[PDB]
UniProtKB/Swiss-Prot annotation, chain A:
Found in a U snRNA export complex with PHAX/RNUXA, NCBP1/CBP80, NCBP2/CBP20, RAN, XPO1 and m7G-capped RNA. Component of a nuclear export receptor complex composed of KPNB1, RAN, SNUPN and XPO1. Found in a trimeric export complex with SNUPN, RAN and XPO1. Found in a nuclear export complex with RANBP3 and RAN. Found in a 60S ribosomal subunit export complex with NMD3, RAN, XPO1. Interacts with DDX3X, NMD3, NUP42, NUP88, NUP214, RANBP3 and TERT. Interacts with NEMF (via its N-terminus). Interacts with the monomeric form of BIRC5/survivin deacetylated at 'Lys-129'. Belongs to the exportin family. This is Exportin-1. The chain holds residues 715 to 893 of 1071 of the full protein. It is found in: Cytoplasm; Nucleus, Nucleoplasm; Nucleus, Cajal body; Nucleus, Nucleolus. It comes from Mus musculus (Mouse).
Curated annotation (Swiss-Prot), chain B:
The chain holds residues 8 to 180 of 216 of the full protein. Keywords: Acetylation, Cell cycle, Cell division, Cytoplasm, GTP-binding, Host-virus interaction, Hydrolase, Isopeptide bond, Magnesium, Metal-binding, Mitosis, Nucleotide-binding, Nucleus, Phosphoprotein, Protein transport, Transport, Ubl conjugation. The modification N6-succinyllysine is found at residue 152. This is GTP-binding nuclear protein Ran. It catalyses: GTP + H2O = GDP + phosphate + H(+). There is a cross-link at residues 64, 145 (Glycyl lysine isopeptide (Lys-Gly) (interchain with G-Cter in SUMO2)). The modification Phosphothreonine is found at residue 17. GO terms for biological process: actin cytoskeleton organization; cell division; cellular response to mineralocorticoid stimulus; DNA metabolic process; GTP metabolic process; hippocampus development; mitotic cell cycle; mitotic sister chromatid segregation. The record marks 62 as: Essential for GTP hydrolysis. Monomer. Interacts with RANGAP1, which promotes RAN-mediated GTP hydrolysis. Interacts with KPNB1. Interaction with KPNB1 inhibits RANGAP1-mediated stimulation of GTPase activity. Interacts with RCC1 which promotes the exchange of RAN-bound GDP by GTP. Interaction with KPNB1 inhibits RCC1-mediated exchange of RAN-bound GDP by GTP. Interacts (GTP-bound form) with TNPO1; the interaction is direct. Interacts (GTP-bound form) with TNPO3; the interaction is direct. Interacts with KPNB1 and with TNPO1; both inhibit RAN GTPase activity. (Microbial infection) In case of HIV-1 infection, found in a complex with HIV-1 Rev, RNAs containing a Rev response element (RRE) and XPO1.
Length: 179, 173, 179
């Protein structure tokens, strides 16, 4: 719990710094250091759920605090400050928890989906990592939580499928293939 | 300290541009912005036998951004074919690139580079990379993302062009 | 008799958010019924209808700010574009309880940009009175001594206090505008 608090403290410290002085700030000691606490925090979270062996207990205790701490934080971050590893970290947990998380896709996809989509829908170049990861995530949900794609409204579903079209139109081999 | 013309070729996303940038700036480009036609880039290495300059003709891999394709190669003095170990397709087309190139340059020191070794899930096992053998090309495993065997291709070409099997990079002012 | 029964029905439906959160159409039907009961002149009905509505909003806050199946726009919008036609017959205190209820819905929209627009319109009605009283005070400060205008400044503030209790930090955009 505390670890999530500090993660969020740093995540909000970084985004502000960027919002106040542009991407450039990322390129200096303190920020790069704060990025590290975030990234290792994510490694730890995903690194454990992977080797965990009690899906439900994991979905009912270690997942909900992720929502406000890491997801809605990723949402509120300025585009330049959002952590790509947040998406891939989440992708891994979907692969593991599967059906036990199918009911949280609504809550999750809200935060990350649309907001991330708007970062990668202008061209095919900017925010590479965000492209790659985002679709590892979308792949995972579709793969182990398909029922979710039915719960949501036709308007949202469409937005999802057309996102896939968008994937396989990429010139980055990996992104287009995942699509 | 004379120079040489180095033509760099391969499929798209192969990492041709990214490879070149690393050398001059030291930075690593994460984005994929396809090269239109060509982009001559002068590179300099300092050896024990005086400075050496490569005019890198970073050409395009994509078919619609081709350019004066075979037209760029003329007057070349060495080349580098590059493929991506994460995509077999880019290794199966290597023969096509070596083709166009030698039909323009009959005898020039060439190097074959398998880029992207850093990515753990490698789809092109070393066991398969044998094309250089019968065509008498040099080969290396490289990564623009980790500087792995970073300077091998250039060090080797230098050995050949300066006719010295003992040339060594030193980075002396 | 009908009012005593209707209240109990409304009490029961108020105690089972789990059921409301799974059945939007019902939730929708309930909320609208409450909006109708809000012009009921029979004793207590209006207090009943408000209590239930704030209750429900608190417990179902997310369903009002996210688009449901069968809709093309978040329910809040219909509610906000109609605040006056709904609360026109309510008493002062009930109007505050109503504003607090919508405040909770606003607090669900975690997306910065949209929450800000929601907030601006949420406080638009009260703001008019404020802005009005303020410009006149910048011509004659003897107006802030006027019994009626002081009665309004009280109620406006009282409304501002409830909205803040529910909206939370993001409400800063409002406080700053009048601080
Ligand atoms: N993981 C990893 N990625 C790499 C490596 N080298 C290049 N890339 C990525 O692969 C893509 C290759 O981009 P470019 O260098 O422009 O490829 P290119 O050969 O110039 O493509 P064209 O100009 O169209 O012929 C970029 O997104 C790089 O970030 C590598 O060694 N490891
Ligand atoms: Mg290029």
């Amino acid at each position: 719990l505390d670890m999530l608090n500090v993660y969020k403290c740093l995540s909000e410290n970084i985004s502000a710094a960027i919002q106040a002085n542009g991407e450039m700030v990322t390129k200096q000691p303190l920020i790069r250091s704060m990025r590290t606490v975030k990234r290792e925090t994510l490694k730890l979270i995903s690194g454990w759920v992977s080797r965990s062996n009690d899906p439900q207990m994991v979905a009912e205790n270690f997942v909900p605090p992720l929502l406000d701490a890491v997801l809605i934080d990723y949402q509120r971050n300025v585009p330049a400050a959002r952590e790509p590893e947040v998406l891939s970290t989440m992708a891994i947990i979907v692969n593991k928890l599967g059906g036990h998380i199918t009911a949280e896709i609504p809550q999750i996809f809200d935060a990350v989906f649309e907001c991330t989509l708007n970062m990668i829908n202008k061209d095919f170049e900017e925010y590479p990592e965000h492209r790659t990861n985002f679709f590892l995530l979308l792949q995972a949900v579709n793969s182990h939580c398909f029922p979710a794609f039915l719960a949501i409204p036709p308007a949202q579903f469409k937005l999802v499928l057309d996102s896939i079209i968008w994937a396989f139109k990429h010139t980055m081999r990996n992104v287009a293939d995942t699509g | 300290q004379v120079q040489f013309k180095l033509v760099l070729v391969g499929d798209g996303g192969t990492g041709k541009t990214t490879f070149v940038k690393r050398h001059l700036t030291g930075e690593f480009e994460k984005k994929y912005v396809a090269t239109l036609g060509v982009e001559v880039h002068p590179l300099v290495f300092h050896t024990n036998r005086g400075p050496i300059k490569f005019n890198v003709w970073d050409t395009a891999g994509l078919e619609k951004f081709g350019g004066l394709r075979d037209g760029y190669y003329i007057q070349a003095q060495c080349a580098i074919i590059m493929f991506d170990v994460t995509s077999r397709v880019t290794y199966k087309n290597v023969p096509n690139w070596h083709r166009d190139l030698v039909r323009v340059c009959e005898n020039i020191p060439i190097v074959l580079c398998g880029n992207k070794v850093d990515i753990k899930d490698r789809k092109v096992k070393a066991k398969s990379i044998v094309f250089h053998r019968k065509k008498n090309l040099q080969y290396y495993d490289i990564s623009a993302k980790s500087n792995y065997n970073f300077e091998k291709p250039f060090l080797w070409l230098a050995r050949k062009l300066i006719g010295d099997p003992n040339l060594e990079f030193v980075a002396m002012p | 008799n009908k009012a005593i029964i209707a209240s109990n029905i409304m009490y029961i439906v108020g105690q089972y958010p789990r059921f409301l959160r799974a059945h939007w159409k019902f939730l929708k039907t309930v909320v609208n019924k409450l909006f109708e009961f809000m012009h009921e002149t029979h004793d207590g009905v209006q207090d009943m209808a408000c209590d239930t509505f704030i209750k429900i909003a608190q417990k179902c806050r997310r369903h009002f700010v996210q688009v449901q199946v069968g809709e093309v726009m978040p329910f809040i919008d219909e509610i906000l574009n109609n605040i006056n036609t709904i609360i026109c017959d309510l008493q002062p205190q009930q109007v505050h309880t109503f504003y607090e209820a919508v405040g909770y819905m606003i607090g669900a929209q975690t997306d910065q940009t949209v929450q800000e627009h929601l907030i601006e319109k949420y406080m638009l009605l009260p703001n008019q009175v404020w802005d009005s009283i303020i410009q006149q005070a910048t011509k004659n400060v003897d107006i802030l001594k006027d019994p009626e205008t002081v009665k309004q400044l009280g109620s406006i503030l009282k409304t501002n206090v409830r909205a803040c209790k529910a909206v939370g930090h993001p409400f800063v955009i409002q406080l700053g505008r009048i601080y």
